[PDB]
Design a protein around this ligand. Structure first.
Ligand code: ATP
Ligand code: ATP
Ligand code: ADP
Ligand code: ADP
Lengths: 50, 1585, 148, 100
């Protein structure tokens, strides 16, 4: 969030979006099999985790 | 070949003297370019088939030419190498030990070269030495030897740099100084600043044989644990490396001891402030901060290790409490007075402890226990281990996953940066990238903290960080060795702004950086982590070993070569709030959080609400400066309260007081109320109080009374001015180098002069100023130069002044010296002063000598708008804005009246009459009832130039002085019955009105003057002129004291018949005599002025006649071309003036004793503005006018002008090439708008000439008045229509009627017994050839014909029904002898026959004679018959203009001459051609046709040469020295062939001008400048029908 | 016609102003001069009205032209909508005493841009979201108030 | 290249106005009598105007061209070709009227 991908970010709000994505993906919860990579995909569908 | 053979017998070697008392050759230009020209000439002539004149001579001369080229090409390089290496081998000491083999080799080479120089000294002939055998071979051998020895010197320097890697930071000359001046270590001490990080001097033994220790610029001193002595280590590199190692070791030992001591303080709580201060004083600031960091980090780590299990008593709370206790102790300690070094250490400790607090307080107390946790691993953690024997391994700094070490390089004391979260992430990402062997590339808007953050990171790790600034501060020749040094010492690099480099520099340094980065990242290969063979890149074609410590940083605002090698971070928005809070807390301020929270938005508003000027700086640097100033103010208030703890002073008032005291001087008049509104918003209910300075104000008041100025206090008159003076004093106290900036017309100069007088009176310190104008003086002569061969240093003006002040002669420190730079600031010369304005306070001359100004000297600039100045110069010094609202009009009037009542004009009856006049005129100036109303009215009317208040009032004051002088003269003429009080009152009042009318709106059209007069009539009650249908401008205030019209003072003149329309014959008229009176008025006061008017409006004639009318005026006529330089004025002085040093100072006076020289300036606005919008000669003349002198470039001495007055004339600025004059120069010189003469004025001035010529034939004398009326009235209709908007050449002037009269007189000159219809037909012919051939449409021509017939009928009705004589109205003097009118067919046949003969005997293409060609031939013939007949052929190209001109010139026998213009044609060649044609026209009488094409005009200077050649008839700036002497001889001889006497040079020049007048016609062929349009007859040579 | 009073009463749009950030600053200064409050004691409070109520409270600054890109306003309570660019009529701008209280989880910081392209952050608005909605969804959907 | 091949028999020389040896090359070609190809005519040299105007002073069996000061013999078949490479340039009337 700070280095690497965060280095390119300039304003606060895209940094906030980057933080949101990073926390939603990079977590111990993602280890659970029924972890949604993206919720409400076309509404009814949801991307699961392999 | 004749010229080539004669010139080769006179060349001289031009021997000069050298510092080693030897001989040298000067003038490479003369001895190369002319020789190359001779080579070209011989090659061309032998190439050309007309070589059957000389065959063997040309080859001999050519081989001699090639021999000269070979010998001189070798000789110049040999001389340069010899002088440079002689300087190196003699000036530098210890050379006997430094490679003595090359010393003896150079001794032999120098012996041979000096033998050759003795030979060439005995024979100073160019070929006498060429004929000496063995010269060329010996010269080539010397060149080879010099090359070899120079290569040896270079390799020795490179070897020495390789020995000590830090020597790569210095240049070759400085390295030579270091390696040569081993005994004089004080010479080495100045170079230590560049090589090392912080040390500036090395503390040596008493006998200068043992290196006891080091120090720094600030004053911090480090004693070496083990001193190294130069005795047993004599080599410079050896003991320098030993000093470096000893510095590392001493730093390590002191760090270990300080850590041991700080463990005692950090054991628990209850820190004793007394012992804490002793510990701080004992250890260096770098070591103190390091010890605090190490203690805090190890304590937090131990506490976390304890907490790892869980809630184990929370020792983190204890660590936080200990940190809080230490912070409270430090906050208390800063409130008490401390030494500056201890203060800086204490502030660094406060900021670092604040960071250490914040970390634990917020990020760690959120339930963290693990010692391997990232949120603890994220922070920069210090680990000190003194067990390691190696110096560089004991201290280890680890950030995130990176594990750096601490290179123990002394950094002096550098200001630290508060660890903002932005700076925290910057450290994180830079450390992460450096771990991955990739340089960091932060980016963002400038002034956000990129370079400073990188430097702070480098200082944290102990790395020596080099900063390479971007703008104008790159030296690519040294960049390679800089990179080599960085890679060989493990230093850092931080480019301040990498994108500012232009493409070539950017690409080159980017390639170098790419190579460096690839070599660096080779150290972290996954399979080559263990580096066996050291990684080596390729710089300067050598394998430079790469040190892992080395790192490169670049900042954007990114190249493709470095995208894959550099990481980037955005620091666009810094954290101003936290920075301000921490800085205020470190300064002892209580409740710093609220103060920061208020101050940051205030500056953000100041970037928003206020206006936008370059000098404004609301950046982060300014905020920090304001904060430190506020800390100083708070400490000063605490100290003052003490002498009558005390933690009750209101902080907000202190903060706003610091803000105002720092910033208000830079504010404009409009912004100040806005600033106070913003203060009332952000800081409500808080008041700002000015410093009283009552001790200085009394002396200021006394000076103002004795300087006739007006003193004030607050809201009364002058309050703003005196406040500005006080702010100037404040800026003088704070810093050196301040510049006072404001619109021209404020009290800038007066402010500093008065304040210097006040300082001299009050403090008792004598103040001597040195006002220097740098624009007029050459920059090379401003600072100095080194001649290419001798390399002798001749100091410049400013250099000489600074050397005189620094030299222990007089007043080095007991007197305050104020170098005031008057003019405009621009990069060209402020480049040198950049190093003097900053904290370096040094002047590095090109010779190499470094000059530091003593503390008393203050380098002030006075400029007007500050728009072409580099931001570096502006930021390096403070400034105060002198708004135009400061200098109030009423205060101007008060100063004027006080000066008039005090200073006698003729420096008691004069003083009495002045006081009476002042008492009379008091109710007008001071009262805002007449003069102020008139001033604002004149400002809201239109004027030919921009209106400046100071000029418009200075002209008024000058005319009032003249009125007082007139009254004095009136009393002088009549001793009895003197000027009575009532007559005085009437005269002074009416003259005051008259002087307002001619000062205000005196440079505007007649309608504008009438509007001003009507407004005055509305706003005054004094006696106005009686007649209400005549402009007030027309009248004159008689010495009796009544309105008398100027027309009554207009006399009549009767010029002689042979002087009709003569070069210089002015006939008196209304405008002429009135402007003559005005010029006398201004010229009495020695006040320069310029007459501004349309071309050919009677400006030069009027002013020239006025000047020569005065008996004490000697006039020298100067022409100001575009390329006119101050050198022209200097030459005029050196020719017509003499320098004497007998007075207190050198004084320049005319050679003619008792004569007031005047340097008349043709087209004073013509000289072109330089690329910084300043005219060199204009600034030079302003320097002469204002300060009454200048500086001699020869000896840098102020010479004052005596009996020199400047008067000029110029066209309106709207015309092409007319750059408006500077406002500073404009206020000195009032201008008079000389408009085209009115109808009645033309009637009178030309009826004089009509009567004069018609007196020749008595019968026609009775028709003079109708002829004049018809001429002027026809010109009238021709002037309303056919304006310049329809056609650019449709301009009409009273010069056309002069040509008209001259032409009619020439026609009647040999003729006699003409009837009335004859005079009318000649008049009609001249009207047709002057007013109709210029037209471009047939409708215009028919309209002109109808008007000609109409005016002929209405003006004189007694002519026969024939229009003039017939329709064609033809004139030719070939058919008969006199200028008799001819018919159509006979003239056509004659012209056709002669044209057939012409193209048969000279040309090759047949010419057809159709109607247009015949008419144009007739016109050009008429032009050639009249001397000074100059023709303007406008028409399509290739239509026969040149051919027809040549044909008619051949018919009339005029020799044809034209310029052979090529691509590389220069001004000097054109002037030589002008000299040749003038010589053939003045002497050796020869009617010459000078046919110039539009393409022939290659430069505008040629057009100016034509402008001065045509109207005047001669070029004053063309004849110089030998040319003048030879032309004088030819003129004096040609005088006695034609029947005149030699007499004097002046009358012979007059006769030469007359001969050029009669024997030179210039014809201009142009394809479809207004000044060039006039003084030439315009012929619309239209395209073939 | 009215001097200072009308200069505040007018429902000036924010899209057309040349420097609308300067307008926000000027409004903040006006509210500060009112009651002599310090400039930093003021934070923007935004309520969306309708039908041009114009019930100004001597601190409300009715502004028009703001476009909510990505959701809708329901009595000042946001709600994600698939239909984008819902016009917001008369979003009243109020300034009140900042109590430095912790903002509840039902608030979001919406960046207010001028152009359709987002390259100029004029100011930020804190809206209350619906109960079911969450800040993460709003942040990722890209909602942002637009003046034009 | 078409002109180069066409007049290679006459040793046509390729040069440009930008070349500093342009005057020397012109003198050599004019004396010997060989065609010349001067490209880069945008920066036209006004020294060529006597040649373009065909001012032939056939005096005393010596046809000469007034090039600067030293007038050189006008050899027959002195064909100087002017050329350029850009199609957008507004030539001055002096050069335009003297060429096809
Ligand atoms: N009370 C006063 N204080 C200062 N100058 C005054 C005062 N009253 C009248 N003056 C006049 O105002 C002028 C101040 O201009 P000053 O000489 O200080 O400026 P400068 O640096 O020479 O030029 P400029 O300001 O036009 O660039 C002078 O002509 C001075 O006589
Ligand atoms: N009142 C006059 N009496 C006599 N001659 C006059 C008068 N007015 C104009 N002239 C004539 O008009 C001409 C003006 O002279 P001059 O060429 O010096 O003009 P100028 O205004 O100084 O020109 P420029 O602006 O080009 O320097 C002269 O020939 C002069 O004799
Ligand atoms: N985080 C910070 N804390 C304190 N001062 C800072 C900080 N960042 C920048 N500064 C100050 O700003 C001034 C200029 O910063 P600079 O490094 O020139 O920025 P830039 O790299 O954009 O030119 C420096 O004098 C520095 O003291
Ligand atoms: N009236 C004419 N009759 C025949 N040839 C003409 C005439 N006027 C011009 N020329 C031809 O034009 C050629 C060059 O004209 P030139 O004098 O250069 O025109 P310009 O002076 O307008 O450039 C000459 O060779 C001449 O033969």
């Amino acid at each position: 969030a700070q280095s690497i991908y965060g280095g390119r970010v300039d304003n606060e709000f895209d940094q906030r979006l980057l933080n949101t994505f990073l926390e939603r993906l990079f977590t111990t919860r993602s280890f659970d099999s029924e972890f949604k990579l993206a919720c409400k995909v076309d509404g009814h569908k949801d991307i699961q985790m392999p | 070949l004749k010229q080539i053979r004669e010139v080769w017998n006179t060349y001289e070697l031009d021997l000069v003297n050298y510092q080693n008392k030897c001989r040298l050759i000067r003038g490479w230009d003369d001895l190369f370019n002319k020789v190359k020209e001779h080579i070209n000439s011989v090659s061309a002539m032998k190439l050309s088939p007309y070589y059957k004149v000389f065959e063997e001579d040309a080859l001999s001369w050519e081989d001699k030419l090639n021999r000269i080229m070979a010998l001189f090409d070798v000789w110049i390089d040999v001389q340069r190498r010899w002088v440079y290496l002689e300087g190196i081998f003699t000036g530098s000491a210890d050379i006997k030990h430094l490679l003595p083999v090359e010393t003896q080799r150079f001794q032999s080479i120098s012996t041979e070269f000096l033998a050759l120089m003795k030979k060439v000294s005995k024979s100073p002939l160019v070929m006498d030495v060429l004929n000496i055998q063995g010269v060329q071979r010996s010269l080539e051998r010397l060149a080879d030897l010099l090359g070899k020895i120079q290569k040896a010197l270079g390799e020795y320097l490179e070897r020495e740099r390789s020995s000590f890697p830090r020597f790569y930071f210095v240049g070759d000359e400085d390295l030579l100084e270091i390696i040569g001046n081993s005994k004089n270590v004080a010479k080495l001490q100045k170079h230590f600043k560049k090589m090392f990080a912080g040390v500036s001097s090395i503390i040596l033994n008493e006998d200068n044989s043992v290196v006891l220790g080091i120090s720094s610029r600030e004053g911090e001193e480090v004693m070496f644990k083990t001193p190294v002595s130069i005795t047993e280590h004599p080599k410079i590199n050896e003991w320098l490396t030993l000093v470096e190692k000893e510095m590392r070791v001493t730093l390590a030992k002191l760090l270990a001891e300080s850590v041991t001591e700080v463990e005692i303080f950090g054991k628990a709580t209850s820190i004793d402030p007394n012992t804490y201060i002793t510990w701080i004083d004992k250890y260096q600031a770098q070591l103190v901060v390091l010890s605090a960091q190490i203690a805090w980090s190890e304590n937090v780590e131990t506490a976390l290790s304890s907490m790892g299990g869980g809630g184990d008593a929370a020792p983190l709370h204890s660590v936080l409490s200990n940190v809080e206790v230490t912070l409270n102790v430090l906050a208390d300690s800063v409130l008490m007075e401390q030494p500056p070094l201890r203060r800086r250490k204490l502030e660094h400790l406060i900021t670092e402890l604040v960071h250490q607090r914040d970390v634990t307080r917020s990020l760690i107390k959120s339930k963290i226990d693990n010692a391997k946790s990232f949120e603890w691993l994220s922070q920069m953690r210090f680990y000190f281990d003194p067990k390691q024997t190696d110096v560089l391994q004991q201290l280890s700094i680890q950030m995130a996953n990176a594990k750096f070490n601490y290179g123990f390089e002394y950094l002096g004391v550098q200001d630290k940066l508060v660890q903002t979260p932005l700076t925290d992430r910057c450290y994180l990402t830079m450390t992460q990238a450096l771990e991955a062997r990739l340089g960091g590339s932060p980016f963002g808007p400038a002034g956000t903290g990129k370079t400073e953050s990188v430097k702070a990171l480098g200082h944290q790790l102990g790395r020596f960080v080099l900063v390479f600034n971007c703008d104008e501060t790159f030296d690519f020749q040294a960049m390679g060795r800089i990179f080599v040094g960085l890679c060989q010492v493990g230093a850092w690099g931080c480019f301040d702004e990498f994108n500012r480099l232009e493409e070539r520099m950017l690409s080159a340094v980017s390639q170098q950086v790419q190579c460096i980065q690839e070599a660096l990242r080779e150290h972290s290969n996954p399979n080559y982590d263990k580096t066996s063979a050291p990684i080596t890149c390729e710089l300067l074609n050598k394998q430079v070993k790469v040190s892992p410590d080395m790192a490169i940083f670049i900042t954007m605002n990114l190249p493709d070569n470095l995208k894959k090698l550099f990481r980037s971070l955005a620091m666009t928005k810094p954290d101003r709030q936290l920075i301000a809070q921490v800085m205020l807390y470190s300064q002892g301020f209580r409740t710093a959080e609220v103060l920061a929270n208020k101050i940051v938005p205030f500056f953000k508003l100041c970037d928003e609400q206020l206006s936008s000027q370059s000098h404004y700086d609301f950046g982060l640097r300014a905020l920090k400066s304001v904060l430190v100033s506020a800390g100083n103010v708070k400490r000063e208030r605490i100290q003052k309260i003490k002498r009558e703890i005390a933690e009750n002073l209101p902080e907000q008032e202190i903060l706003i007081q610091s803000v105002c005291e720092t910033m208000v001087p830079k504010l404009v008049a409009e912004d100040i109320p806005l600033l106070f509104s913003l203060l009332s918003d952000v800081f409500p209910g808080v008041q700002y109080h000015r410093g009283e300075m009552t001790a200085l104000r009394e002396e200021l008041k006394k000076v103002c009374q004795e300087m006739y100025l007006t003193y004030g206090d607050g809201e009364e008159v002058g309050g703003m001015w005196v406040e500005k003076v006080l702010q100037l004093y404040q800026i003088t106290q704070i810093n050196h180098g301040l510049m006072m900036v404001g619109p021209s017309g404020s009290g800038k100069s007066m402010a500093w002069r008065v304040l210097l007088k006040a300082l001299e009176r009050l403090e008792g310190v004598e103040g001597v100023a040195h006002i220097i104008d740098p624009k007029a003086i050459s920059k090379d002569h401003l600072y100095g130069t080194l001649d290419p061969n001798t390399r002798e240093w001749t100091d410049g003006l400013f250099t000489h002044v600074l050397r005189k002040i620094i030299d222990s002669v007089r007043g080095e420190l007991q007197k305050r010296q104020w170098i005031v730079f008057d003019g405009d600031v621009d990069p060209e010369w402020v480049e040198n002063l950049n190093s003097v304005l900053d904290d370096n306070k040094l002047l590095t001359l090109p010779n190499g000598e470094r000059l530091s100004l003593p503390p008393n000297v203050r380098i002030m600039f006075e400029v007007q708008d500050l728009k072409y100045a580099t931001l570096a110069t502006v930021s390096r010094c403070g400034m105060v804005w002198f708004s135009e609202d400061v200098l109030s009009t009423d205060m101007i009037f008060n100063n004027f009246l006080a000066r008039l009542r005090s200073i006698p004009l003729d420096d008691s009856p004069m003083l009495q009459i002045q006081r009476d006049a002042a008492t009379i005129m008091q109710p007008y100036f001071t009262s805002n009832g007449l003069v102020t109303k008139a001033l604002e009215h004149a400002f809201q009317l239109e004027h030919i130039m921009d209106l400046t208040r100071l000029r418009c009032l200075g002209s008024l004051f000058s005319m009032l002085h003249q009125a007082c002088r007139n009254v004095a003269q009136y009393n002088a003429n009549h001793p009895d019955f003197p000027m009575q009080i009532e007559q005085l009152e009437r005269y002074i009042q009416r003259y005051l009105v008259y002087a307002i009318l001619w000062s205000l709106s005196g440079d505007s059209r007649l309608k504008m003057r009438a509007e001003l007069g009507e407004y005055i009539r509305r706003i005054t009650t004094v006696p106005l002129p009686t007649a209400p249908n005549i402009p007030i401008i027309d009248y004159e205030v008689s010495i009796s004291g009544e309105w008398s019209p100027w027309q009554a003072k207009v006399p009549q003149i009767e010029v002689e018949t042979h002087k009709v329309a003569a070069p210089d014959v002015v006939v008196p008229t209304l405008d002429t005599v009135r402007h003559e009176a005005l010029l006398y008025t201004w010229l009495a006061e020695h006040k320069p002025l310029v007459l501004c008017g349309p071309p050919g409006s009677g400006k030069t004639m009027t002013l020239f006649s006025a000047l020569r009318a005065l008996p004490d005026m000697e006039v020298v006529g100067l022409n100001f071309s575009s390329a006119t330089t101050p050198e022209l004025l200097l030459k005029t002085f050196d020719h017509y003036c003499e320098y004497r040093r007998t007075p207190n100072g050198v004084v320049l006076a005319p050679v003619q004793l008792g004569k007031w020289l005047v340097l008349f300036c043709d087209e004073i606005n013509l000289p072109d503005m330089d690329k910084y919008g300043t005219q060199r000669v204009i600034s030079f003349i302003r320097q002469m006018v204002e300060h009454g002198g200048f500086y001699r470039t020869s000896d840098q001495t102020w010479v004052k002008l005596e009996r020199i007055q400047f008067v000029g004339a110029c066209n309106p600025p709207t015309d092409p090439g007319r750059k408006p004059l500077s406002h500073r120069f404009l206020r000195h010189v009032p201008v008079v708008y000389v408009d085209y003469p009115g109808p009645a004025s033309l009637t009178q001035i030309y009826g004089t000439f009509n009567r004069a010529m018609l007196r020749l034939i008595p019968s026609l004398r009775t028709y003079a008045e109708p002829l004049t009326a018809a001429m002027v009235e026809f010109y009238t209709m021709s002037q309303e229509r056919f304006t310049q908007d329809t056609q650019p050449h449709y301009i009409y002037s009273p010069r056309e009627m002069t040509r008209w009269v001259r032409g009619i007189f020439e026609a009647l000159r040999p003729l006699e017994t003409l009837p009335v219809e004859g005079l009318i037909r000649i008049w009609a012919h001249e009207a047709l050839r002057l007013f109709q051939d210029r037209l471009v449409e047939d409708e215009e021509r028919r309209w002109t014909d109808e008007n000609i017939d109409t005016v002929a009928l209405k003006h004189f009705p007694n002519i026969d029904r024939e229009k003039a004589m017939s329709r064609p109205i033809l004139y030719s003097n070939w058919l008969s002898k006199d200028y008799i009118p001819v018919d159509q067919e006979e003239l056509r046949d004659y012209v056709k026959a002669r044209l057939k003969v012409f193209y048969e005997e000279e040309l090759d293409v047949p010419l057809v004679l159709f109607n247009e060609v015949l008419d144009h031939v007739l016109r050009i013939d008429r032009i050639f018959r009249q001397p000074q007949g100059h023709l303007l052929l406008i028409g399509v190209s290739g239509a026969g203009k040149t051919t027809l001109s040549r044909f008619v010139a051949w018919m009339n026998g005029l020799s044809v001459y034209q310029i052979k213009v090529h691509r590389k044609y220069t001004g000097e060649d054109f002037d030589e051609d002008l000299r040749t044609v003038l010589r053939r026209s003045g002497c050796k009488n020869e009617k010459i046709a000078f046919i110039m094409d539009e393409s022939n005009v290659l430069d505008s200077g040629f057009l100016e040469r034509m402008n001065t050649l045509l109207a005047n008839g001669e070029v004053p700036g063309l004849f110089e020295g030998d040319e003048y002497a030879t032309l004088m001889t030819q003129c004096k001889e040609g005088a006695q062939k034609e029947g005149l006497m030699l007499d004097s040079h002046e009358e012979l020049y007059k006769w030469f001008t007359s001969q050029v007048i009669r024997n030179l016609h210039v014809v201009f062929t142009m394809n479809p400048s207004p000044a060039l349009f006039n003084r030439c007859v315009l012929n619309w040579f239209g395209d073939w029908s | 016609s009215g001097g200072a009073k009308e200069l505040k009463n007018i429902h000036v749009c924010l899209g057309g102003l040349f420097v609308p950030e300067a307008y926000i600053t000027a409004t903040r200064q006006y509210v500060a001069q009112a009651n002599s409050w310090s400039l930093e004691e003021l934070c923007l409070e935004v309520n969306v009205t309708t039908s041009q109520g114009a019930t100004l409270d001597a601190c409300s600054f009715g502004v028009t032209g703001l476009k909510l890109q990505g959701a809708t306003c329901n009595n000042n309570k946001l709600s994600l909508s698939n239909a984008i660019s819902t016009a917001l009529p008369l979003t009243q701008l109020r300034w009140v005493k900042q109590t430095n209280t912790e903002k509840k989880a039902s608030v979001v910081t919406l960046p207010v841009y001028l152009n359709f392209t987002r390259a100029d952050l004029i100011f930020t608005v804190d809206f209350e979201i619906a109960t079911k909605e969450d800040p993460r969804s709003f942040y990722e959907r890209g909602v942002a108030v637009l003046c034009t | 290249e078409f002109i180069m091949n066409e007049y290679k028999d006459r040793k046509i020389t390729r040069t440009s106005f930008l070349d500093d040896a342009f005057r020397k090359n012109l003198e050599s070609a004019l004396r010997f009598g060989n065609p010349l190809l001067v490209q880069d005519v945008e920066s036209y040299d006004p020294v060529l105007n006597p040649v373009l105007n065909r001012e032939v002073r056939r005096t005393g069996g010596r046809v000469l061209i007034t090039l600067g000061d030293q007038d050189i013999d006008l050899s027959p078949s002195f064909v100087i070709f002017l050329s350029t490479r850009d199609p957008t340039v507004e030539f001055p009337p002096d050069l335009c009227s003297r060429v096809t």
